[PDB]
Design a protein around this ligand. Structure first.
Ligand SMILES: NC(=O)c1ccc[n+]([C@@H]2O[C@H](COP(=O)([O-])OP(=O)(O)OC[C@H]3O[C@@H](n4cnc5c(N)ncnc54)[C@H](OP(=O)(O)O)[C@@H]3O)[C@@H](O)[C@H]2O)c1
Ligand SMILES: NC(=O)c1ccc[n+]([C@@H]2O[C@H](COP(=O)([O-])OP(=O)(O)OC[C@H]3O[C@@H](n4cnc5c(N)ncnc54)[C@H](OP(=O)(O)O)[C@@H]3O)[C@@H](O)[C@H]2O)c1
Ligand SMILES: N#Cc1ccnc(N2C(=O)CC[C@H]2C(=O)N(c2cncc(F)c2)[C@H](C(=O)NC2CC(F)(F)C2)c2ccccc2Cl)c1
Lengths: 392, 407
């Protein structure tokens, strides 16, 4: 009798990540959880064959089922169009899914204490959140004034601001905007993420330079905090504070981690989760590529050692949310247990070649210092079997 | 006999940096180089007594003599206005000098093998450059925001819709860039790449901002193909445009040794500036588009905290590296302008002595803290401000004796 997992939208991907993704399901997920699985093949050949229809259907399935877990995919370039003889240079599946779903992206680096970090003092993870893409830019052919005007719907408080009077020559100009609703959705997603993980939240802004534009972000976060989150933040002993981007960077340099950083906006050790405005829909993926170099080694029968942590944490993050929506304690436990096993295995000295190279330096790595992809996956599977057995 | 260094504009500054600036001149520069020195005292008291006229004169002297070396100065605020009983809250000397000369600021680290950096694989520094002007306002309620271009030659006005706020309000802004500022940014970046002998990359988001960022990519490309391609090829270096996301990822896997000209989006640019263990290991060079005018300084402040201890007679341990490198990078540019081989060698030797002294285990407290962690540093792990300067002086004497073997 396995854990009833419920409805999960799964997206298969490309190259080396496609193989590790199958290994994750076969050795870590399917032996313990049964799912009403909505599988979508986002491999480049299948996106080409279906005229990218499979991507739009996967995005539609995440809207309906609320939980998506996605494998890394190829975003075609000129070189990829010739390799697969593609009909078109298809847009990024991540971009297509992101535009259909909307929300805030939270990036979380997975911390293993024996694996070096950018800043050595980082002991707890840092979560970066961000909601520009709709700016109106143009070329200014020569001298003349560029003005930006606001005309209210009634007509009454109309204002015209001089952006610049070009005099010596031309250049470029652009108008940018941010709707209140977008700032409020980002603020709510950030406060909720901070309470879910139990860490303080910091919003970074440049309000000393953009007093009006960034000033509105700061005020909206401060108002939303004082109105509906400070009582829950005080209860869990966490806080919200604004920081100037230059100040925030210096504070992160002297920090030990353990916070959410909201911005106005080893590689296999980071996840990206899209949290939709409805507070119910989530899409989790590994924040890395398809590992082409390792895939070429695999195609030549050579032994590979590819870090699967980010892809495992896409599964655990998705299953953790699926368990929270359904109130499934068994699933919530399984998701947390797989994350613990993944970190415990690496911290105990069992890791892939790339992690061993971070520690020793590539020229110093011996075969005995690491496990190949299959050996690491089997080591995790043995530790997971033990962790789950000692729970029942 | 001393080297004849030629014309240098020097600007004296404030607090701790003023103290070590004098030790550098006394112990490292003056015993070896004779200069036609144009010195301007940018001390806070002198700027107040001259009504900031010294700052404007220093900037005009840099324009005339092409080489400026600046000590850190106090940018006044309310506490400074009280402390010094200032007449006005004088503007930043760097802001006044930058406005007069123009140019792009390049920040470069000083690498030491035994001193940790953001990315361990970095062996050569990464030089990042940046060449307010934005018009932002709140949109209080529903309505239309439009941006308009009215040609001064009387031709038809062009209007672009920014956004129809159908419900509620928000914020909006207008930004601009002149073609001449973009051209100046490209010239300075190409000239900096050629001076250092490293490849140059321009990072934009031209995929999203097709006309705004595309103008940067296109101007850089056209200036490269017309007046820098052969000079770059002749040094085994090149210019390449890169999307900001590709660029931040290449810099994370590279060993350093490249110029990164970024149009901006400076979260990553700040992490590189503050990612070499200490503020004492970073220099900030203003490079003018003429390829002749330069102004170098430490990319840090006057070190007020250390200065208060100095006033009390307490021992201090202030890092002079960035201040030494403002002098050496200034002297290196002076040497290249005059084809002074003797001066070019001296500036090179002084940089190598500084790096070697630290690499041999002799350093200030901030560098010892980078190695052992601040709680674990003990007095015996470092040298005080004077001891380190005396050790650099001793080592410089030894290096110059070894160099006489070339002749
Ligand atoms: N998330 C996405 O769907 C996404 C985002 C961007 C790009 N892409 C696509 O990915 C394709 C291929 O990108 P890429 O080959 O540069 O892949 P990548 O995953 O970004 O990795 C580049 C290199 O870094 C190392 N590495 C990265 N992740 C690793 C991991 N998990 N475990 C071990 N080593 C890892 C490997 O080198 P070593 O052997 O030296 O360790 C690898 O060759 C592109 O065509 C692009 O369109 C996908
Ligand atoms: N370019 C310029 O002229 C410039 C730029 C910035 C600031 N300033 C001015 O400098 C004054 C003081 O500013 P600030 O204290 O905020 O910044 P700062 O002088 O850069 O000092 C901040 C801290 O950084 C460390 N530090 C910086 N340079 C160091 C060095 N050479 N050796 C050792 N440690 C060093 C010290 O850390 P610990 O305290 O931990 O020892 C120091 O207290 C202000 O009046 C400001 O306006 C001038
Ligand atoms: N807006 C915004 C915003 C805010 C914060 N982080 C980002 N980021 C990205 O866009 C991806 C990487 C990441 C980032 O810039 N960094 C970072 C990374 N991990 C964890 C953090 F808390 C930050 C920096 C970083 O990676 N610097 C290196 C890349 C480089 F610029 F070449 C040097 C970095 C490194 C070390 C100390 C502080 C900093 Cl901010 C964007």
């Amino acid at each position: 009798k396995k854990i009833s997992g419920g409805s999960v939208v799964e997206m298969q991907g490309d190259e080396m990540t496609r193989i590790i993704w199958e290994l994750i399901k076969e050795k870590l997920i399917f032996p313990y959880v049964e799912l009403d699985l909505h599988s979508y093949d986002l491999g480049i050949e299948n996106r080409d064959a279906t005229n990218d229809q499979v991507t739009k259907d996967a995005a539609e399935a995440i809207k309906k089922h609320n939980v998506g877990v996605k494998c890394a995919t190829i975003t075609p370039d000129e070189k990829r169009v010739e390799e697969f003889k593609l009909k078109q240079m298809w847009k990024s599946p991540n971009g297509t899914i992101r535009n259909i779903l909307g929300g805030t992206v939270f990036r979380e680096a997975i911390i293993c204490k024996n694996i070096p970090r950018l800043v050595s003092g980082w002991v707890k993870p840092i979560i970066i959140g961000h909601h520009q893409y709709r700016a109106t830019d143009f070329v200014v052919p020569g001298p003349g004034k560029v003005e930006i005007t606001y005309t209210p719907s009634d007509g009454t408080q109309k204002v015209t601001y001089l952006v610049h009077n070009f005099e010596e020559g031309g250049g470029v100009a652009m108008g940018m905007y941010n709707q209140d609703k977008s700032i409020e959705d980002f603020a709510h997603s950030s406060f909720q993420m901070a309470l879910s993980k139990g860490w303080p939240l910091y919003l970074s802004t440049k309000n000393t330079i953009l007093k009006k534009y960034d000033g509105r972000f700061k005020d909206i976060f401060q108002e939303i905090y004082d109105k509906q989150y400070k009582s829950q933040f005080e209860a869990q002993k966490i806080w919200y504070e604004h920081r100037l981007i230059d100040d925030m960077v210096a504070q992160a340099m002297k920090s030990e981690g353990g916070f959410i950083w909201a911005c106005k906006n080893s590689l296999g050790m980071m996840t990206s989760v899209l949290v939709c405005p409805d507070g119910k829909t989530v899409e989790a993926e590994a924040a890395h590529g398809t590992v082409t170099r390792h895939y070429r080694m695999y195609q030549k029968g050579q032994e590979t050692s590819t870090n699967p942590i980010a892809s495992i944490f896409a599964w655990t993050r998705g299953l953790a949310h699926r368990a929270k929506l359904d109130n499934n304690k068994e699933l919530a436990f399984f998701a947390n247990a797989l994350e613990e096993v993944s970190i415990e295995t690496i911290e105990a000295g069992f890791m892939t070649k790339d992690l061993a190279a971070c520690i020793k330096g590539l020229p110093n790595v011996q075969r005995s210092d690491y496990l190949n992809t299959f050996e690491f996956m089997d080591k995790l599977g043995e530790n997971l079997k033990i962790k789950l057995a000692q729970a029942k």
